[PDB]
Amino acid sequence: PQTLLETTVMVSTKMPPHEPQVRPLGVYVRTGRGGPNGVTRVVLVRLTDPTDPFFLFELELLEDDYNAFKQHLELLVDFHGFPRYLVGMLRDIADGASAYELSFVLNSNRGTLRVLETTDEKTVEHISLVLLRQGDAGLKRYLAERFQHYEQSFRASEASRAVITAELQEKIGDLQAA
Amino acid sequence: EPQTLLETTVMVSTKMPPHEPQVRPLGVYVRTGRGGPNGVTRVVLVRLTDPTDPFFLFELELLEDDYNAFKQHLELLVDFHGFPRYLVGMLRDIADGASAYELSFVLNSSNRGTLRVLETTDEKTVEHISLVLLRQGDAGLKRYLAERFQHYEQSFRASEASRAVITAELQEKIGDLQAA
């Protein structure tokens, strides 16, 4: 299970409680294994909001439903190659040097994420993904994991800070005696 | 002012039906603030958590308006104002290790549990306080998990920020003392 992309990206969002607006969102793309028996290859696309921890949308693209998916979007790429394609596009948008935009529009418990090139005449669509809002179960899991992760990271930070403070304090303490 | 009187981990004798009777570390958290049906009644929150299980969350929201009944039932001789001071002092003593009192948390069987501070003499197990904590629902749990997540992320950032500062501040002090 490898994580191909974790970053924050600026996104044109239509959400009914709010107004149409351009917000930063977290996009996460992890390839792994899953499905009804944990045997089918999978690509996860997860959309999150750094300002709202209860905002969580995911698409679990099962390899067995990829043919239909490939055809509907008229892609010319393996299941193997698809995330590479998607991530490259997102990364370009994230890294700021790109002509493409991201749109996330609600429609509720489903939302569509689109990579769009905007020319003079037309808004050209390069990909469209339907992400499902996650239920309490999956959200709790997400929140838990994040919490555990950042706590763990916070500990590690302090641990290695104490190490370094001491390592250099001894190098200050030896330059002082000499 | 919503003030946090105690956040610490304390060793606790626990009866929980999925597990065996055992002495685990648990997180006790005592925050005084304001709340209730209209957000106007003074409140004391006691929260019990498990560092090993993020889905374990038990809380008592002691409303000042139901404290008289509470005070009588436990036969306390303390204000609502003084009560948490009392409770926290006891817990802190137990946490500090310099204490004759123990903590007991026992579940039912599964959404209520009782937390007791107990002094064990030769003849009797004397009870100094008993609190009933309610397991919290997905709503309150998600809120908890969210807050913790945000907090530790925020803290993790701050740690790194001030680490980079210090590494540089001392590396410059290593970089200057060697040449001089």
Numbering used by the authors:
A (entry chain A): 131 to 237, 244 to 314
B (entry chain B): 130 to 238, 244 to 314
From the paper:
However, by introducing the F257E mutation to strongly weaken head-to-head dimerization we managed to crystallize construct Lm SAS-697–320 F257E that contained the N-terminal head domain and the first seven heptad-repeats of the coiled-coil domain. We subsequently solved its X-ray structure to a resolution of 2.9 Å. The asymmetric unit of the crystal contained four molecules that were highly similar to each other and superposed with an rmsd of 1.17 ± 0.50 Å in secondary structure matching with 165 ± 16 selected pairs. The crystal structure revealed that the L. major SAS-6 coiled-coil domain is a parallel dimer and packs via conserved interactions against the N-terminal head-domains as seen in other SAS-6 homologues. The F257E mutation abolishes head-to-head dimerization in solution, yet, in the crystal, due to the high protein and precipitant concentrations, some of the SAS-6 molecules present are found nevertheless in head-to-head dimers and form a curved octamer. In this octamer residues Y215 are also swung into their own hydrophobic pockets, while E257 point away from them. These data suggest that the closed Y215 conformation corresponds to a low-affinity dimerization state of the head domains and might therefore constitute a potential regulatory mechanism of SAS-6 oligomerization. The presence of curved SAS-6 octamers in the crystal of the Lm SAS-697–320 F257E mutant that is strongly impaired in its ability to form head-to-head dimers suggests that wild-type versions of SAS-6 would adopt even larger assemblies.
SAS-6 organizes the rotationally ninefold symmetric cartwheel, an early assembly intermediate of centrioles that participates in establishing their symmetry and diameter. The cartwheel is organized through the homo-oligomerization of the highly conserved centriolar protein SAS-6. High-resolution crystal structures of zebrafish and C. reinhardtii SAS-6 fragments together with biochemical and biophysical characterizations demonstrated that two dimerization interfaces in SAS-6 mediate this oligomerization: a coiled-coil domain that forms a rod-like parallel dimer; and a globular N-terminal domain that forms a curved head-to-head dimer. SAS-6 is a highly conserved protein that is found in all eukaryotes that have cilia/flagella during some of their life-cycle stages.
